[PDB]
């Protein structure tokens with residue numbers, strides 16, 4: 001039934017309504033609920049420096065209603081890790097590679113929490129990246145994500161020492177994209193595919209190569 005839609009520069013003309021809706025939900029969730037005050041904006045849209053022409057959005061849609069999602073950004077451009085949190089990756093270094101994309105802004109609307117959507121969103125990042133030939137995703141995440149990643153079978157590689165970020169323990173890591181990880185998740189969600197790709201085909205790795 002309901003799917004996760006891959007939205008990028010090549011097909012966003014089919015999703016302008018949905019994209020604006022997701023920016024407002026991000027404000028509701030990350031600003032009003034999670035109190036990430038540095039992200040508050042007077043337009044009520046949660047938009048940062050990594051929302052541009054090269055961003056890819058993976059949004060869970062029920063009809064045209066956004067119920068969850070996350071985003072991917074090429075590490076060949078200045079990234080949140082390289083610009084905002086490079087000290088979190090001081091041991092191994094910040095990623096910079098067309099085959100590594102930065103993963104952020106994971107959310108589920110209140111109406112869909114503690115249900116089937118969460119594991120579908122985990123499957124979605126693996127499915128999209130495997131299809132595109134992306135090898136790893138990078139993340140700056142709160143340490144409570146570690147057991148969640150492990151529960152979903154995600155292979156995680158820490159890049160530096162955990163540190164407090166605005167009162168919350170946070171760490172930089174890569175996640176390995178794995179066919180085997182995805183296969184298990186497909187079985188668990190009971191669907192052979194969770195990512196829908198409408199409109200023109202996106203060549204993500206090619207685009208990321210152009211960026212650097």
Ligand SMILES: Nc1ncnc2c1ncn2[C@@H]1O[C@H](CSCC[C@H](N)C(=O)O)[C@@H](O)[C@H]1O
Pocket residue numbers: 036037038039048049050080084103104105106139140141142165166170
């Ligand atoms: N573009 C940005 N610039 C500066 N800080 C940001 C940011 N995006 C998120 N943050 C901060 O990072 C912390 C959350 S943890 C890091 C980012 C988070 N995993 C995400 O998905 O976005 C919060 O304190 C938040 O205010």
